């Protein structure tokens, strides 16, 4: 019954392909400059309104995550995802997802 690493990787690949299709779709809508769907190797972040803190349920296809939790990004007021200054990284808080690992 155990989920193998190989299945977990397949599920990530499936979520990544869905994210790509999602980005292409929302790019055909009327829009200003919302923060756009992005794949980070764990999650597909959804559209974000300028300024807002974006909460996503810890993904159900990650077998070991806390599914009652959320992960967080922030969309800046220019429509760019918030960064970690001085590091080559987008700001994201996955603490709730990993609290029991």
């Amino acid at each position: 019954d155990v989920m193998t690493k190989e299945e977990q990787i397949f599920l990530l690949h499936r979520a990544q392909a869905q994210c790509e299709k999602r980005l292409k779709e929302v790019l055909q809508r009327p829009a200003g400059r919302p923060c756009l769907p992005e794949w980070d190797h764990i999650l597909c972040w959804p559209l974000g309104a300028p300024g807002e803190v974006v909460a996503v349920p810890c993904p159900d296809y990650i077998y070991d995550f806390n599914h009652k939790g959320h992960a967080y990004r922030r969309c800046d007021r220019n429509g760019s995802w918030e960064l970690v200054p001085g590091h080559n990284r987008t700001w994201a808080n996955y603490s709730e997802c990993v609290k029991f690992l």
């Binding site: 155990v2 989920m3 193998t4 690493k5 977990q8 990787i9 980070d40 190797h41 764990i42 990650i62 077998y63 070991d64 967080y72 970690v84 590091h87 990284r89 987008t90 700001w91 994201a92 808080n93 996955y94 603490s95 990993v98 690992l101």
Partner: peptide, 22 residues
């Protein structure tokens, strides 16, 4: 060990991912 293999892969994704405590 299949549980460990899977979890240790997740460790790398989180380390490379969770950045709010940097």
């Amino acid at each position: 060990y299949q549980d460990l293999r899977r979890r240790f892969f997740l460790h790398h994704l989180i380390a490379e991912x969770h950045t709010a405590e940097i």
